[PDB]
Ligand SMILES: [Cl-]
C-alpha cells in the first residue's frame with residue numbers, strides 16, 4: 152500500500168528494461184552508473200537498455216567468501232546519467248518481511264506489480280544446477296520474464312528476482328556491502 | 335497507493351480467472367451470483383472459473399438505448415457462493431480519474447497490478463470492427479491477456495478492460511444501472 156507507492160517511484164527513478172543475448176531482464180540502478188542484473192542474464196561488453204545500446208564497462212559476477220554463487224552481476228554502464236543512490240534502502244543483512252511487492256519492467260511485463268506476501272530467508276538452493284546462497288523466497292506462481300524483478304517493501308529494497316520453481320520465486324538479496332568498492 | 339490497497343482487496347474478494355472457448359479472461363463478481371465479462375469472451379452454457387467448471391444460467395450482451403455495443407456481458411453463475419455486493423463502488427456515470435489501477439488475474443498474468451495514470455472519457459470507438467460506446471481510455475502499452483482486467487481508483491471500480499491498440503487500453507465503464515434488473 153505505502154509499499155506499492157514506494158515501488159512505483161523506485162521503478163520510475165531507478166529501473167530499466169534490459170535485453171541480453173540471454174534474454175530480457177529488469178535492471179535495477181544502484182548508484183552512480185553501477186547497476187545490478189541477475190547472474191544468468193550474462194551481459195557482454197554491450198547491452199540493450201530501454202531499446203537503446205549501452206556499453207558495459209565492467210562486470211562482476213558476485214560470490215560469497217567461499218566462491219558460492221550469489222546470482223548477481225554488478226555492471227558499470229557507459230552512460231552520462233547517474234542513478235539516484237538507493238543504497239540507504241539496502242539492508243546490511245537478509246531482511247524478512249510479512250508483505251512484499253515484486254516490481255517487473257520488461258516488454259513481456261511492462262510496469263507491473265505483484266504482491267507476493269511473506270518473504271522468507273530460504274538460505275541455500277540449487278538454481279539451474281548451481282548452488283546459490285542468500286536466497287529470499289516467496290509464494291510465487293511464477294513465469295519466465297520476471298528475472299530482475301525488484302522485490303521491495305516500504306522504505307526497503309530487498310532483492311532482485313532470479314528464478315522460481317513454478318510455485319515459488321527466489322530473489323537474490325541486495326546487500327549494502329556489495330556496493331561500496333572504490334569509485 | 336491507497337488505490338492499490340483497494341485493488342488488492344477487490345481482486346481477492348470479487349475476481350476470478352475465467353477460461354472460455356474464446357480465451358482466458360478476468361471476471362469481476364458484482365453481487366449475488368451476477369458477474370461481468372468483456373463481450374468478446376462469448377461465454378457458453380458453461381465456463382471454467384478458477385480451473386473449475388461452472389454453469390452459466392443466463393447471459394446478457396449489453397447494449398445502449400440504440401442497440402450499440404457496450405462490450406459487456408452479464409452472466410449469472412450456477413454456484414452457491416455469493417459475491418460481495420460491490421455496486422456502491424460503481425458510478426452512475428463515466429468517471430474520469432487522474433490515477434488508476436488496472437488489476438489482472440489470469441494464468442498469463444496472475445494477481446498483477448498496473449498503474450495506468452490518467453483515465454479519459456474517450457467516447458465511441460470501433461473495436462474489432464464493432465462500434466462501441468462508453469469506453470474509458472488510458473495510456474496502455476498493452477498485451478492480450480488483460481481482457482477483463484478491473485480498472486479502479488480509491489473507493490472506485492471504474493470499468494472492465496476490453497481491448498487496446500498496442501499503445502492505449504480501453505475499458506468498458508461499469509455503470510450502476512446495468513445491475514439493478516429484478517432478482
Ligand atoms: Cl540511499
Ligand SMILES: [Cl-]
Pocket residue numbers: 419420421422423
Ligand atoms: Cl456496495
